[PDB]
């Protein structure tokens, strides 16, 4: 089942500042009271991140190129953002990766799906509307796990496709800021590595409708792109990354 959403309001996408966000732990190694310089796919400091809204009538679910990695920031209340759409052609010709969080659990599947042009979920005021796919033909990998999840919650995600490994880094942060990304430091812990072994070049966020036509719940999310660069990470006595230096930002940090 697919439904065209035809009551949207046309608006150009926004842009905002990354500040010092997007940092994650590059490895599984504890470090104590030391400064570590590492070369990896990192998000640039103070960079231009693409800002998408869901407000009422805005409903931003496009398909964007994945590039070498995706930083996903989510200023979320009442759990509108539920998952992501991963693949190359997003049809039954190729093999696609599905990440969903419905009302019970999180399901990770690598199959040949027929995606709708406008995929979404829906909550009736109770979740009783699933319109994200129309078919599922050839599955190679299924994985059911524990659930990952004024704006009250801040959800940061890093997705990487390196040597057939899918790395998900995440961090939950309690914020109370209304509109933009807060300025601060929070290193993203590694959550789960997925043996997917598939080509991914495009991605798409999954939202949830509110029914009482349809109404879009108040949400905003941010997409940043990971680039190969050097960070100088500071590890405290307890071994958490408390500060970082982008070596290619300005000559002082160089």
């Amino acid at each position: 089942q697919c439904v065209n959403l035809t009551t949207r309001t046309q608006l150009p996408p926004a842009y905002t500042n990354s500040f010092t966000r997007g940092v994650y732990y590059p490895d599984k190694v504890f470090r104590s009271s030391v400064l570590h310089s590492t070369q990896d796919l990192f998000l640039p400091f103070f960079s231009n991140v693409t800002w998408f809204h869901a407000i009422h009538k805005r409903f931003d679910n496009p398909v964007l190129p994945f590039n070498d990695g995706v930083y996903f920031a989510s200023t979320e209340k009442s759990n509108i953002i539920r998952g992501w759409i991963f693949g190359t052609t997003l049809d039954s010709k190729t093999q696609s990766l599905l990440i969903v969080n419905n009302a019970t659990n999180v399901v990770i599947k690598v199959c040949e799906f027929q995606f709708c042009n406008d995929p979404f979920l829906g909550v009736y005021y109770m979740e009783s509307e699933f319109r994200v796919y129309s078919s599922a033909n050839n599955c190679t990998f299924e994985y059911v796990s524990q659930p990952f999840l004024n704006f009250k919650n801040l959800r940061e995600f890093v997705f990487k496709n390196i040597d057939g490994y899918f790395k998900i880094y995440s961090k939950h942060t309690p914020i109370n800021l209304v509109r933009d990304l807060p300025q601060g430091f929070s290193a993203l812990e590694p959550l789960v590595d997925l043996p997917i072994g598939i080509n991914i070049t495009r991605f798409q966020t999954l939202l949830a409708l509110h029914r009482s036509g349809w109404t879009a719940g108040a949400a905003a999310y941010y997409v940043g792109y990971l680039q190969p660069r050097t960070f100088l990470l500071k590890y405290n006595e307890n071994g958490t990354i408390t500060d970082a230096v982008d070596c290619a930002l300005d000559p002082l940090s160089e």
Binding site: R31, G164, P195
Partner: protein, 361 residues
């Protein structure tokens, strides 16, 4: 010292001759819990097996496979591998396993082989010439056979062309034995391709039904999810042992650690990027890795014209880990420590000197 100096006479002094090593005593291999086993119980010991023209293919992936239980079972009458070794199945890793289960006749068990030509090989189940994996077969006369004849197991008898490897054909097209036109209508020279077996308990060995499971391995660029079991040993602490923790190997003394790791972190590094802390995978505890007490062995002697008495200095080595005296330079064996102070004759270090008068320090 004479060997090191390449001379038969040794002048008075201290000579570093060798390098004391604390030899590793045990080997400790700690590997995490062997969970999420591959479902071989629902393939080898299922309720009803499939026919050979419609053999059931089960995909074994994202699990750890214990082939030792399968190999040590004595119920299997045939265990023949064509691309791997049976004793190295628990050591090698593969991307995925295809398990093909069917029932055939006892005389056709040899026909599941590379290069073998038969009715089952040409029309029912074909293996490639570069086949890797193992074919497992066992007798099932007590289960499949019926006194009225088990006709449920069908097999393809006729086809125009031979099979490609790992190709199924469940089609029921009427074969043309002759050249007469048949539009699906049976005649004198047009027969149905699928015939039923005659499994009965009064038949001897060779006509009894044999259940065959064929495991095929893929070694593509996908990650090797299917691996063999890991036999972790017990953990020994406070000794210079060879540790192997989740593929990270080394030599060290493993003591209890006060460093509180975050739960996602496994190893620990110092400033100089050397692994000095680690987490045991079996029990989530943090261990410090102190390097074993390596040291320099120095020989303190007067001239061989004077005397042949020597003393041995183990540099930076405590005296309990090797006329025994503990200095800040190390452990000195063979010198009597005295409370008097003299001029330095042979320097030991940290204010300690040795002289001959016996050897005193």
């Amino acid at each position: 010292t004479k060997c090191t100096l390449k001379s038969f006479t040794v002048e008075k002094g201290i000579y570093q001759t060798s390098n004391f090593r604390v030899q590793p005593t045990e080997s400790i291999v700690r590997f995490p819990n062997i969970t999420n086993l591959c479902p071989f119980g629902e393939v080898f010991n299922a309720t009803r097996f499939a026919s050979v023209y419609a053999w059931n293919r089960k995909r074994i992936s994202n699990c750890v496979a214990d082939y030792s239980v399968l190999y040590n079972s004595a119920s299997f009458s045939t265990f023949k591998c064509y691309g791997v070794s049976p004793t190295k199945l628990n050591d090698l890793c593969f991307t995925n396993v295809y398990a093909d289960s069917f029932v055939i006749r006892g005389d056709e068990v040899r026909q599941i082989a590379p290069g073998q030509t038969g009715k089952i090989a040409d029309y029912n189940y074909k293996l490639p010439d570069d086949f890797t994996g193992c074919v497992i077969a066992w007798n099932s006369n007590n289960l499949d056979s019926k006194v009225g004849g088990n006709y449920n197991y069908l097999y393809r008898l006729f086809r125009k062309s031979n099979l490609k490897p790992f190709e199924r054909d469940i089609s029921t097209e009427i074969y043309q034995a002759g050249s007469t036109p048949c539009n699906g209508v049976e005649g004198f020279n047009c027969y149905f391709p699928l015939q039923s077996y005659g499994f009965q308990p009064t038949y001897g060995v060779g006509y009894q039904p044999y259940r065959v499971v064929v495991l095929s391995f893929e070694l593509l660029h996908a990650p090797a999810t299917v691996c063999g079991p890991k036999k972790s040993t017990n953990l020994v602490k406070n000794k210079c042992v060879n540790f192997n923790f989740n593929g990270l190997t080394g030599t060290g003394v493993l003591t209890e650690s006060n460093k509180k790791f975050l739960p996602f972190q496994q190893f620990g590094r110092d400033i100089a990027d050397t692994t000095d802390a680690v987490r045991d995978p079996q029990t989530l505890e943090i261990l410090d890795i102190t390097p074993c007490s390596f040291g320099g062995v120095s020989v303190i002697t007067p001239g061989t014209n004077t005397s042949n008495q020597v003393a041995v200095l183990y540099q930076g080595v405590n005296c309990t880990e090797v006329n025994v005296f503990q200095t800040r330079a190390g452990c000195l064996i063979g010198a009597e420590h005295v409370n008097n102070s003299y001029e330095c004759d042979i320097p030991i270090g940290a204010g300690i000197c040795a002289s001959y008068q016996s050897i005193i320090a």
